[PDB]
Design a protein around this ligand. Structure first.
Ligand SMILES: [Zn+2]
Ligand SMILES: [Zn+2]
Ligand SMILES: [Zn+2]
Ligand SMILES: [Zn+2]
Lengths: 329, 329
């Protein structure tokens, strides 16, 4: 069977199992973790929290997370490897570019961005030999000309290697149509693309449209429920309405319409967050102490109460991630 | 009574500094970019080999020390600096602070948080290396942004606590030194601890003598950037400006012939690797200035001595002025 690159080497597809497709170990910035580890307290304390948070998720049944932290999110793959061993949970690193690219990237052409994505997928990240197994992009509304270059190079890298592509959208936007049109003009099939953060909006026909076209619907922000008055305006902006049941009911909504094979459910959670207000992580731990165990401990039983069969959720959590992470040339 | 400054190899006394270039770069990149994609420079080894050959060419021309004012967001690899320092046998001073390409993990911080980060790389060390920075680089492009004010204030407070000096980036034509000097003084920073850089990008001798009279060091640090009618490319004419190196060097004669030889610092603002601009800009630069950072001791100094400046006045500017500038209070 096919193999999938992890931060501990390649693993057979059958061993991925229960997989979260959009997660972060640390949401920071390029080189920030090395230069200022005291921002989190200490690098030792961040490894402790991440390892402890993953063993809690592993106890609930999670076996693999897809860390979609890219170069400009501060992806330190050695940190991803250290917590993958002490917790015994497969982690799949990513390549691509978020929406905080340093100008050493913003000045690059699409051909140059293609060679850098290919390097991290085929050669390895930095100097570790660890390769990524997924590509991450991002757009802010009407995508910038450079963001359009990024979307082009990611699809060209995906066509050469078969590695999938997952996107960042302000799900409360219609970046999906804009991202899909650029992907379709590059000849990439929608079965290798995930329009992430689709659970922010309540537009059902926008989700059904993506799935009917073959795209993977990433409902990957489940624990971000309505904040109420339990946080500042910064929290309410990034965490706010609606409730997590409203997000989880979008899984039930697509399943009832025959698109059970087009769903990927995750948390978009992290254990370190530097690209936002300070101590936002303590707010997120008040709202969700389960962390990456939220979906197995809370989302799965909530759907099961509403009459969703467990074989259907066993395909959304295991079958589709295995199908989507397998390099398809 | 016992003064010494931190280099990338460790503390050395001020007496052993000598001929010092006060604003140079080994590599102009972005944070974490060198180790993530070193093939952009052909190879990391080739970047070292070219850098070591360049500094030996400068020490053969009399250069004994340079200051690498590359910050975290300029791609400063303190280990790369330590390697080329021992290999070329040239003292190099590292730098903390922030340039005008900070990531989200930096733009989202407050004045105290940035003050602690600056104090970290000055007292504790940079990254996990134990190498301490001996200067602070701040940057405003025209009028200062609200974030750049917080940086300029965090540099003044960190300077007062450690006695370490501060150098700036200015769009010399817009006279950023006026607003920069006002905030440095509102934080209680003695003007003799600050150097307004890129002051030779303007002919405003009323603006230059004003800063020298107030007690600031004047950074005439872009000497080799002589604009040639090279036809292009448009990116080349935008980086080299419009004026000749004789015009830049004559600004040294004007400030000496004004009474402020104690207030001048001369440098190249040169580098051996450029990723934060267009591709192959480094080849165009080495084509124009083949002497690299030996341009000033080989061309500028003989030009000024031909214009009548005594060698004793020149020795104080290139040796005594930087030594006085780096010795902490
Ligand atoms: Zn996202
Ligand atoms: Zn995310
Ligand atoms: Zn500059
Ligand atoms: Zn510079």
């Amino acid at each position: 069977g096919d193999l999938i690159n992890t931060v501990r080497g390649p693993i057979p597809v059958s061993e991925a199992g229960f997989t979260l497709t959009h997660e972060h170990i640390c949401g920071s910035s390029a080189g920030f973790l090395r230069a200022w580890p005291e921002f989190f307290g200490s690098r030792k304390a961040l490894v402790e929290k991440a390892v402890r948070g993953l063993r809690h998720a592993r106890a609930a049944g999670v076996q693999t997370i897809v860390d979609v932290s890219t170069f400009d999110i501060g992806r330190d793959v050695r940190l991803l490897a250290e917590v993958s061993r002490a917790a015994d949970v497969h982690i799949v690193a990513a390549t691509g570019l978020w929406f905080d690219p340093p100008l050493s990237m913003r000045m690059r052409s699409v051909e140059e961005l293609t060679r850098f994505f290919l390097r991290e997928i085929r050669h390895g990240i930095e100097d570790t030999g660890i390769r990524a197994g997924i590509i991450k992009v991002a757009t802010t509304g009407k995508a910038t000309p450079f963001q359009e270059l990024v979307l082009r190079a990611a699809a060209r890298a995906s066509l050469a290697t078969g590695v999938p592509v997952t996107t960042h959208t302000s799900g409360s936007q219609r970046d999906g149509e804009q991202q899909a049109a650029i992907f379709e003009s590059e000849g990439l099939s929608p079965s290798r693309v995930c329009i992430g953060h689709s659970d922010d909006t309540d537009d059902l026909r926008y989700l059904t449209g993506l799935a009917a076209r073959g795209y993977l619907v990433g409902l990957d922000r489940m624990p971000y429920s309505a904040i109420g008055l339990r946080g500042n305006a910064s929290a309410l902006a990034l965490f706010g309405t609606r409730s997590w049941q409203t997000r989880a009911l979008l899984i039930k909504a697509l399943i009832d319409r025959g698109y059970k094979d087009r769903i990927l459910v995750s948390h978009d959670w992290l254990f370190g967050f530097s690209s936002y207000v300070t101590n936002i992580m303590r707010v997120m731990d008040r709202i969700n102490p389960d962390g990456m165990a939220f979906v197995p401990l809370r989302v799965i039983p909530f759907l099961r109460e509403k009459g969703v069969p467990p074989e259907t959720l066993a395909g959304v959590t295991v079958a589709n991630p295995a199908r989507f992470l397998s390099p398809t040339v």
